[PDB]
Amino acid sequence: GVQVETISPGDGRTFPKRGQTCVVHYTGMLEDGKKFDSSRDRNKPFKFTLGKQEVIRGWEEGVAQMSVGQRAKLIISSDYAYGATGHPGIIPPHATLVFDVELLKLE
Amino acid sequence: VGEIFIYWSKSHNFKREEQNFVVQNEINNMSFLTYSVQTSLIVATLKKMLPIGLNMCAPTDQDLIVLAKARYALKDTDEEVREFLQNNLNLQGKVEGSPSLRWQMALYRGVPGREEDADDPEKIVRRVQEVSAVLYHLDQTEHP
Amino acid sequence: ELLLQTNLINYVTSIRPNIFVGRAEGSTQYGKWYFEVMVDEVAPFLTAQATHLRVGWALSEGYSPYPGGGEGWGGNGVGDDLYSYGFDGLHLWTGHVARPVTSPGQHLLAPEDVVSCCLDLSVPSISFRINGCPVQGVFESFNLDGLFFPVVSFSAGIKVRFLLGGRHGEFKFLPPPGYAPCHEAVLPRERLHLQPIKEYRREGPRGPHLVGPSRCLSHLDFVPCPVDTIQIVLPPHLERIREKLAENIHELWALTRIEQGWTYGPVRDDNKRLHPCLVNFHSLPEPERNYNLQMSGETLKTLLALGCHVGMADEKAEDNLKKTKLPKTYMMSNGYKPAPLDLSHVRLTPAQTTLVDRLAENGHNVWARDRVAQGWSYSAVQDIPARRNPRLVPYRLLDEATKRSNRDSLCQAVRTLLGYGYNIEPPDQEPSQVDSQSRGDRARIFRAEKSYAVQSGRWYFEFEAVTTGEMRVGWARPELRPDVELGADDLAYVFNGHRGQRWHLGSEPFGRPWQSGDVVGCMIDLTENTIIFTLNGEVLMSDSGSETAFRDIEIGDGFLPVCSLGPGQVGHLNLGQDVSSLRFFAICGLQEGFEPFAINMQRPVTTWFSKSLPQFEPVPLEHPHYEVARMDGTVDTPPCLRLTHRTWGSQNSLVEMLFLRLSLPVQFHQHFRCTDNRDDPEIILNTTTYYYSVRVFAGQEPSCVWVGWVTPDYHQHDMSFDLSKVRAVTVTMGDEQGNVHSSLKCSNCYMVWGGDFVSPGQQGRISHTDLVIGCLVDLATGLMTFTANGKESNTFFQVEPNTKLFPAVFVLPTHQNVVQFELGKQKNIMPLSAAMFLSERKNPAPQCPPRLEVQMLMPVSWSRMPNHFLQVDTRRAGERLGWAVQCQEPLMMMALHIPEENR
């Protein structure tokens, strides 16, 4: 894998720790630019706990790299993404994913 | 002007004398407005003045106007049409019933000085009868 | 890729100052310009979609992003086509592609960010600085066939300020050496302000105003083009008058000097209040005398060159002239009494007034050309040491005061000539029509939506003419075409009020012309099948005196309100949703029984307008001039799509440039590879190279054919096309110092000219052999190559991964048999069907499925106007703060996306 490219800076000091709940707002696109998911469409931030394996590996590492209040772009290869199986009906097999993730807060 | 037009429509000598005068004197009714019956000055003047009478009549009186036109086609006299309307004061258009009548009445009441109108059934009957007579005779003149 | 896609997207709009700069041979314009934008407020996510904010430059002709749909997923702003070049904080935007660019502490544009944009037209190049730090990326080698203006594109939720220098915004950073503040580019007859770009609609006092196309300046409008006056030889009889006119002009000069207060002194200085040249003409120094004399000779030579003839009429007239009296007060230290020659006895024909205007134009243009040759340029602020002048612009663009001054100065000379008696015969003027665009394309047509068509009743609406130029208004049929003048065909009955006319299947006199603010009431009576027009409540009559404009109208599908506005025109369409808003309904129509068109509508009537963005559409099966035949593949030939000119070599034949493409694209791979005559099975099954060909038939001139590919965003309906007109730009990313890291070329048209493959000996005569041009694309490496008659060509192209390319052919027909798309193959190379269709990905047999067809470029198309528009507030914040642009209320639309066309 996952590459992180900052879009807007965070505080630069606080980073998620294992067992902490990260609240994020994200938009997901395929490598060719086709949007397939977005929490902003549902108007509800997405919460997940680090280290519980609730999210794909690319997310688990990229959000950990990010810092609170930061906006970033995560480029996740297939292996860190759903991989060969994919997500039938949503993500094709062997698909690189691009995410625009904002880390709103830690709880 | 409407009474003169009604006399012209009713009298067969009137139309012929008007026609003869125009042809003999080579009057250019087209020049006057800017020969054919549509260019007759009586009809042209009545048509130009008709909007004044229609504005005199209120929108709710359209059905009464249709009834009066039907009676005039039945050839009853002016006083007989007056009596018919006086008895059928009802059958007036229903603003709630129809949806064009709503905005028509809004526009009618918007103009000032039109609030103290339609309160007198005799006034309603007079205007309805006059406009209906003019309209009936105009229709006969337009299409035989 | 198959089903239509949907998504909610933000409305985006662009704002520019009225600053236009360009480059041309002999132009009076400076070449290097600089401006800044300061960001005060940005809401990163006002809606679900990220806020849009881009700054940059755009080309006057070509950059026209309309609200709503467009390229890609809509929201088109700066850098979403090949006419604009934008910077958003993290990327360089051009051609709807985002290219990352490095800067210290790079981040998306945020509050208190200052973006400095520098344009150097000499290279040409566009560079950016963010908060004073260089942005390691540049645009260069872009087209220079228009005028460039600063621009910011944005969605709702932004507040920015243009800083243009001078009194119009104080720069936070020093412009690079040699670059000029953009406030100096404001033209003499204009005032600096912020405006939208190519708007078809604006808010008005009574209601929204419909706006026709704007008249735009061209980069060639800044090149002075005087008539040469050196080859002209001055006749001796005119030589006699040359000195006399010089003396009279000097006398007028002296009287003007005494009016201003100029007086005599050995040296010249304004504050010292003295002049060396104030002495008599003969007493005037010989160099200045000869200088006035040669200006005189230039006046007569310009007269001759313009072409009017000068002939001596009366010597008694010459002898009757006398000098006016002036007092001792007008007498001034020189000692010579100014003696201006009286000319009250002579007057000017209006033709000769036009002549004096033309003479002043020529004089100013000659002066401007000489100054440009010397190296001067235009600037709203005068800078003599820098050779910048406020007047160094063509006469047509000069302001009224200077024009009047020069015109009077020359009218005095014409007065002198006529008083001396020389008759001057203004030459006959031959009108010339520029016809820059077709008339139907030029006029913008607005109409009600098709679903509102009325098939019965009596309907009324109003159209107020804010301007008084070319505008038509009336009733159209639902199948009205967008590229035809209103009323030129049988699909519309309209009234033209510029010159009172009624249009339906042609023009006839009717009514009278309108004044500014006049209201035209349009009525349609479908019980009587008549159409009536009123002007300010008065029925318009024909010459014969008929009240009805049109009669015996067939209902057909129904009728819709319609108007058309020519360039620079403004109208106000009132369909009558608020009956009280109608101004003349009560006077005419209400008693007649007509009903406002939108009387009982709970929502405003939706409208469509004729967008002038060329788009590719399938060739109609009944096109009068063009026919396409689908040829089956035989044993010796592949499948073909052949174009023929139906009406070639006959009257009413249409011969014009034709832009054709195939309905489906080929897409390059996401990732490129790192670093007799049977096909070999393994090679053909593993190849990523695809082929197609074009046969130009014998008799069709190869010099009038271009073959290759286009991207989804090609929109140039250029009636005089050549490879030099193709959009192109190079994006160069480097390091902190030099070290160019990546130079990428970007375009939308990759073609070879058919004239490159005609032998020099074969040139000049019609050939009897067909020309076959083959195009090969490697979808795994991005390389495109061409062959001509089986011979490899030098031309080659490189494209980026995921690029979509449509096979294309641009041709000017010269024969009944023009061209043929051949969907064949070559040895060990796959056909186009294998690339286009997934199920055929491994099938080497050429195919032409029904979906694959020929599409032609149509110049105009119907487009729905949004019901609501972004509210943008522009105002001069202050002398130092600059010009503020603000947009706060969000606006979204539900977009429908066609995947294969990427729009």
Side-chain angles (χ1 to χ4, degrees), chain A, chain B, chain C residues 1-242 244-285 287-315 317-327 329-903:
Chain A
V2 50
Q3 320 157 214
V4 185
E5 291 119 7
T6 188
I7 287 154
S8 273
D11 67 5
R13 284 153 326 101
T14 55
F15 299 77
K17 315 308 297 139
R18 200 185 218 61
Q20 241 176 326
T21 307
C22 321
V23 194
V24 293
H25 253 324
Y26 71 92
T27 303
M29 302 89 59
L30 299 168
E31 212 197 352
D32 54 24
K34 301 159 147 40
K35 196 198 90 191
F36 68 87
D37 189 18
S38 181
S39 56
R40 315 214 177 237
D41 290 335
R42 296 180 288 278
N43 251 306
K44 191 163 33 49
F46 171 69
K47 316 214 220 213
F48 74 100
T49 309
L50 254 198
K52 295 310 208 23
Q53 315 267 282
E54 306 170 341
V55 286
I56 55 188
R57 219 152 93 83
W59 257 63
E60 200 101 43
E61 319 218 332
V63 180
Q65 288 175 53
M66 293 181 60
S67 147
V68 171
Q70 184 186 344
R71 212 178 135 193
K73 191 230 280 213
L74 317 183
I75 300 141
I76 306 170
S77 56
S78 274
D79 40 290
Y80 281 47
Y82 298 101
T85 166
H87 214 136
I90 304 122
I91 287 127
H94 303 117
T96 286
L97 305 188
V98 190
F99 284 100
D100 168 351
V101 180
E102 185 189 347
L103 180 56
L104 305 157
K105 78 214 292 309
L106 272 172
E107 71 188 26
Chain B
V1 165
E3 276 176 279
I4 289 161
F5 163 74
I6 279 157
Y7 289 142
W8 172 91
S9 41
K10 277 176 149 100
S11 279
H12 162 246
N13 284 10
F14 209 149
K15 317 211 215 338
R16 206 217 333 270
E17 290 313 287
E18 200 229 357
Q19 207 42 9
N20 279 339
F21 176 84
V22 178
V23 47
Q24 285 164 16
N25 302 63
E26 282 156 353
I27 307 273
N28 203 14
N29 290 357
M30 212 67 272
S31 78
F32 278 150
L33 294 167
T34 55
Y35 285 132
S36 74
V37 82
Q38 55 271 49
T39 62
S40 140
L41 269 203
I42 277 73
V43 191
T45 316
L46 187 273
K47 284 194 303 241
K48 290 200 142 47
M49 279 302 294
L50 184 57
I52 308 292
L54 294 165
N55 185 47
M56 198 183 14
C57 280
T60 42
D61 314 349
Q62 197 61 50
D63 45 18
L64 287 188
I65 285 159
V66 177
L67 293 183
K69 271 161 61 61
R71 310 269 317 135
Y72 270 115
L74 262 42
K75 272 77 144 52
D76 86 287
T77 88
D78 284 343
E79 192 46 71
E80 289 171 16
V81 173
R82 194 150 334 112
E83 271 325 285
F84 174 83
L85 299 170
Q86 187 68 246
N87 89 15
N88 292 302
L89 208 49
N90 46 83
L91 287 56
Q92 236 165 333
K94 321 301 318 176
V95 65
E96 56 85 4
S98 166
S100 34
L101 267 206
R102 228 169 326 111
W103 70 261
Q104 257 144 4
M105 293 315 285
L107 219 57
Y108 179 79
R109 243 81 67 71
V111 53
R114 211 93 69 112
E115 313 84 344
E116 175 39 28
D117 248 8
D119 312 37
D120 318 313
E122 58 276 69
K123 189 166 318 306
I124 302 169
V125 180
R126 276 208 334 120
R127 61 193 195 203
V128 168
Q129 173 254 305
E130 281 149 8
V131 178
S132 48
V134 163
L135 279 169
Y136 163 57
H137 284 284
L138 212 172
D139 226 341
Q140 312 279 240
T141 296
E142 254 154 14
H143 41 87
Chain C
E1 274 288 327
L2 270 173
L3 305 181
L4 306 167
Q5 310 296 306
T6 44
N7 198 37
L8 294 186
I9 57 131
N10 281 326
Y11 274 105
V12 165
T13 194
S14 302
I15 288 280
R16 63 154 180 227
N18 56 335
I19 281 149
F20 306 96
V21 301
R23 221 191 69 187
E25 195 58 54
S27 172
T28 66
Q29 270 175 322
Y30 196 65
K32 294 149 75 122
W33 298 99
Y34 176 87
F35 81 90
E36 273 176 11
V37 164
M38 180 141 205
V39 187
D40 301 323
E41 300 175 38
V42 193
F45 288 89
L46 190 63
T47 79
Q49 207 184 37
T51 293
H52 175 121
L53 180 58
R54 301 191 204 155
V55 190
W57 295 87
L59 199 71
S60 70
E61 285 322 336
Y63 184 71
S64 61
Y66 294 100
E71 282 308 302
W73 270 101
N76 288 180
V78 186
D80 277 327
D81 50 25
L82 283 171
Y83 292 99
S84 40
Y85 323 90
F87 174 63
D88 76 347
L90 291 163
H91 313 277
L92 283 197
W93 281 89
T94 201
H96 204 85
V97 177
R99 266 160 202 107
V101 67
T102 305
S103 35
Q106 41 173 24
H107 61 287
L108 213 68
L109 288 182
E112 294 145 51
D113 271 9
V114 188
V115 190
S116 321
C117 321
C118 333
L119 161 77
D120 181 359
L121 285 159
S122 76
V123 176
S125 100
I126 287 165
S127 41
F128 300 91
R129 275 194 294 150
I130 181 68
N131 291 313
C133 311
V135 169
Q136 291 149 50
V138 303
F139 305 100
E140 43 181 36
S141 323
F142 42 84
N143 300 76
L144 300 166
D145 60 306
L147 291 169
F148 293 87
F149 56 84
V151 58
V152 290
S153 55
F154 54 87
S155 93
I158 64 105
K159 205 269 182 84
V160 292
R161 284 182 286 109
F162 273 99
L163 309 161
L164 313 162
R167 284 177 344 101
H168 301 284
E170 176 149 327
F171 293 140
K172 316 294 297 304
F173 298 99
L174 258 303
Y179 285 74
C182 275
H183 84 273
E184 300 175 347
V186 69
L187 292 192
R189 40 174 37 234
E190 301 206 29
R191 298 281 110 52
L192 213 160
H193 68 272
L194 303 185
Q195 49 175 205
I197 302 142
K198 299 262 217 248
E199 57 173 359
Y200 54 78
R201 170 260 180 214
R202 84 182 40 144
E203 203 45 71
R206 307 203 78 250
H209 283 357
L210 304 174
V211 189
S214 75
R215 319 165 148 292
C216 329
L217 282 182
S218 157
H219 62 303
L220 304 165
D221 286 350
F222 290 87
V223 183
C225 287
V227 184
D228 43 316
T229 88
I230 191 48
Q231 71 277 9
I232 307 289
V233 314
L234 192 271
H237 55 94
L238 271 191
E239 179 26 80
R240 325 180 303 90
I241 330 289
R242 175 233 196 93
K244 307 169 203 339
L245 163 144
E247 301 143 19
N248 185 165
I249 295 301
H250 188 35
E251 295 287 3
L252 292 164
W253 188 86
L255 60 75
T256 55
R257 290 308 75 59
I258 63 158
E259 305 328 317
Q260 262 177 73
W262 283 90
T263 189
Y264 165 70
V267 69
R268 191 222 158 270
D269 215 349
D270 312 78
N271 56 304
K272 169 192 62 122
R273 190 68 289 141
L274 287 188
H275 211 318
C277 313
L278 197 133
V279 310
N280 214 324
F281 195 68
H282 39 87
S283 324
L284 173 87
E288 275 55 60
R289 222 175 311 137
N290 297 327
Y291 151 90
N292 294 126
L293 282 170
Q294 53 142 344
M295 293 315 69
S296 324
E298 279 300 318
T299 63
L300 305 313
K301 297 150 89 38
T302 36
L303 252 178
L304 289 210
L306 271 310
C308 42
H309 315 56
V310 310
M312 194 55 284
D314 193 25
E315 300 86 85
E318 189 286 331
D319 297 66
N320 298 334
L321 265 58
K322 66 88 197 171
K323 274 46 68 193
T324 73
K325 173 59 166 60
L326 288 185
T329 78
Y330 288 37
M331 241 320 300
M332 188 236 81
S333 60
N334 277 158
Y336 80 130
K337 180 75 76 98
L341 167 146
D342 180 68
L343 293 168
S344 304
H345 41 281
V346 46
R347 273 132 279 278
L348 258 291
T349 314
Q352 278 120 42
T353 60
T354 280
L355 202 276
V356 95
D357 183 76
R358 305 257 308 310
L359 280 193
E361 180 172 23
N362 215 68
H364 179 74
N365 282 6
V366 167
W367 170 85
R369 202 199 36 204
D370 295 343
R371 291 267 78 92
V372 167
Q374 305 256 259
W376 290 65
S377 62
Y378 169 77
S379 169
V381 177
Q382 174 156 26
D383 202 8
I384 286 153
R387 311 218 216 69
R388 313 288 298 283
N389 201 257
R391 283 155 307 272
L392 183 56
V393 90
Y395 195 70
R396 208 176 24 81
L397 305 175
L398 252 190
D399 60 296
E400 281 289 9
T402 311
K403 285 216 266 210
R404 284 201 289 71
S405 158
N406 315 338
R407 254 169 29 212
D408 304 359
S409 172
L410 229 41
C411 154
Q412 290 330 63
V414 186
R415 291 297 208 61
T416 310
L417 265 275
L418 285 206
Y420 267 20
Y422 256 121
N423 64 78
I424 300 131
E425 287 49 26
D428 47 307
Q429 176 55 244
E430 286 100 317
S432 154
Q433 177 56 244
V434 58
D435 58 77
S436 98
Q437 294 102 356
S438 161
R439 313 149 55 98
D441 312 352
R442 201 83 295 262
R444 220 181 244 146
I445 304 166
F446 308 81
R447 62 154 172 80
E449 188 172 83
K450 283 190 214 205
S451 72
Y452 294 96
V454 287
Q455 322 212 44
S456 74
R458 298 196 290 266
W459 302 106
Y460 173 101
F461 75 87
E462 265 174 20
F463 176 86
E464 186 212 327
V466 186
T467 58
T468 79
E470 180 75 19
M471 302 179 279
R472 288 166 206 200
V473 65
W475 303 90
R477 306 203 175 268
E479 294 307 307
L480 179 75
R481 284 188 63 62
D483 41 0
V484 179
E485 280 197 352
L486 266 192
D489 54 9
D490 65 299
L491 292 168
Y493 310 74
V494 298
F495 167 69
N496 182 333
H498 186 209
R499 270 177 272 71
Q501 278 163 325
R502 63 168 166 222
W503 284 78
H504 176 249
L505 270 167
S507 179
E508 303 175 2
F510 179 87
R512 73 188 163 264
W514 50 31
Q515 265 73 53
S516 158
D518 275 11
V519 185
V520 174
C522 319
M523 285 168 262
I524 186 149
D525 190 327
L526 295 187
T527 77
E528 310 239 356
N529 303 82
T530 52
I531 285 169
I532 299 120
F533 294 112
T534 64
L535 193 47
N536 291 339
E538 267 136 16
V539 178
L540 296 162
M541 275 150 321
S542 70
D543 307 0
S544 64
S546 170
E547 302 271 88
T548 62
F550 302 98
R551 289 168 311 282
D552 311 298
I553 292 155
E554 329 83 304
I555 302 327
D557 275 325
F559 286 101
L560 293 159
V562 74
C563 56
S564 71
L565 281 72
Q569 303 309 311
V570 185
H572 169 60
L573 200 67
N574 195 351
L575 292 196
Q577 220 209 336
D578 174 27
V579 72
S580 49
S581 71
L582 297 166
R583 313 245 290 287
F584 295 100
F585 182 54
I587 300 145
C588 205
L590 172 59
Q591 308 307 335
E592 282 69 19
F594 291 82
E595 201 153 303
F597 186 82
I599 184 55
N600 273 332
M601 310 268 180
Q602 27 188 25
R603 273 123 36 219
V605 173
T606 287
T607 38
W608 291 57
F609 81 106
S610 58
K611 202 149 96 171
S612 283
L613 178 76
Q615 301 270 26
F616 278 106
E617 306 191 4
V619 178
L621 249 170
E622 65 306 350
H623 199 276
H625 311 284
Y626 305 127
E627 185 221 302
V628 174
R630 318 185 53 99
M631 312 300 285
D632 275 285
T634 80
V635 53
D636 44 282
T637 77
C640 285
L641 294 158
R642 177 196 297 238
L643 177 94
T644 80
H645 200 306
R646 313 178 111 133
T647 66
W648 178 257
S650 98
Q651 252 63 84
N652 70 37
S653 193
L654 179 66
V655 190
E656 56 172 16
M657 272 291 313
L658 189 58
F659 305 82
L660 309 165
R661 80 162 187 204
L662 291 196
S663 60
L664 286 144
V666 303
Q667 184 147 25
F668 287 80
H669 291 172
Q670 237 300 0
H671 309 285
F672 287 170
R673 276 197 254 112
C674 293
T675 280
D676 182 71
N677 212 67
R678 305 137 298 270
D679 309 318
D680 309 329
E682 57 275 339
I683 310 201
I684 194 87
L685 285 210
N686 303 134
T687 192
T688 37
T689 309
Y690 303 86
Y691 171 91
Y692 97 92
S693 86
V694 174
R695 172 173 308 263
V696 189
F697 291 113
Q700 169 58 49
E701 275 307 292
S703 54
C704 294
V705 192
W706 294 262
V707 177
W709 313 78
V710 292
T711 70
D713 71 333
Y714 184 91
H715 297 289
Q716 314 179 206
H717 195 52
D718 205 350
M719 271 311 108
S720 38
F721 175 87
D722 67 36
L723 281 189
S724 91
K725 311 278 193 81
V726 165
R727 295 306 104 169
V729 59
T730 313
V731 191
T732 296
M733 306 288 183
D735 217 41
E736 301 82 44
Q737 65 299 330
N739 318 345
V740 163
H741 282 2
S742 158
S743 212
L744 285 166
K745 213 170 319 309
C746 305
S747 186
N748 58 5
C749 184
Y750 305 94
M751 308 195 132
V752 285
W753 181 38
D756 294 330
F757 313 119
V758 302
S759 297
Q762 189 49 245
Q763 196 75 84
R765 81 271 282 287
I766 309 109
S767 195
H768 32 71
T769 168
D770 299 354
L771 171 65
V772 186
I773 299 163
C775 316
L776 299 105
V777 297
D778 197 318
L779 293 193
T781 76
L783 182 78
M784 319 160 59
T785 56
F786 300 88
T787 42
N789 288 337
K791 175 166 147 37
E792 174 86 322
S793 150
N794 300 311
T795 285
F796 81 93
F797 289 109
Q798 179 75 46
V799 287
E800 268 168 288
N802 272 335
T803 288
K804 269 195 247 270
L805 283 187
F806 293 79
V809 171
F810 302 165
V811 60
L812 172 68
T814 67
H815 199 240
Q816 59 260 29
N817 277 276
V818 182
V819 293
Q820 202 179 45
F821 282 96
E822 320 193 294
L823 294 322
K825 56 180 306 309
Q826 293 291 303
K827 194 211 202 286
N828 294 336
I829 283 134
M830 280 282 211
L832 269 199
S833 65
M836 284 165 167
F837 307 100
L838 185 75
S839 62
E840 312 306 312
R841 181 72 19 107
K842 283 311 152 185
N843 189 12
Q847 294 161 270
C848 191
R851 201 184 177 193
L852 193 52
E853 80 201 326
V854 183
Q855 300 181 326
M856 52 183 302
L857 198 60
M858 309 289 334
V860 200
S861 297
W862 287 113
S863 186
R864 183 195 191 268
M865 323 177 25
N867 293 121
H868 302 288
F869 297 86
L870 274 181
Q871 307 287 295
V872 185
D873 169 70
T874 59
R875 50 171 278 276
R876 199 224 192 107
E879 303 261 287
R880 298 177 56 290
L881 282 193
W883 286 81
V885 178
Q886 185 167 40
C887 195
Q888 295 303 131
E889 293 310 303
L891 216 67
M892 283 191 112
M893 93 172 204
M894 179 163 191
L896 184 99
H897 177 82
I898 298 122
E900 72 263 23
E901 296 181 329
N902 196 32
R903 60 185 200 92

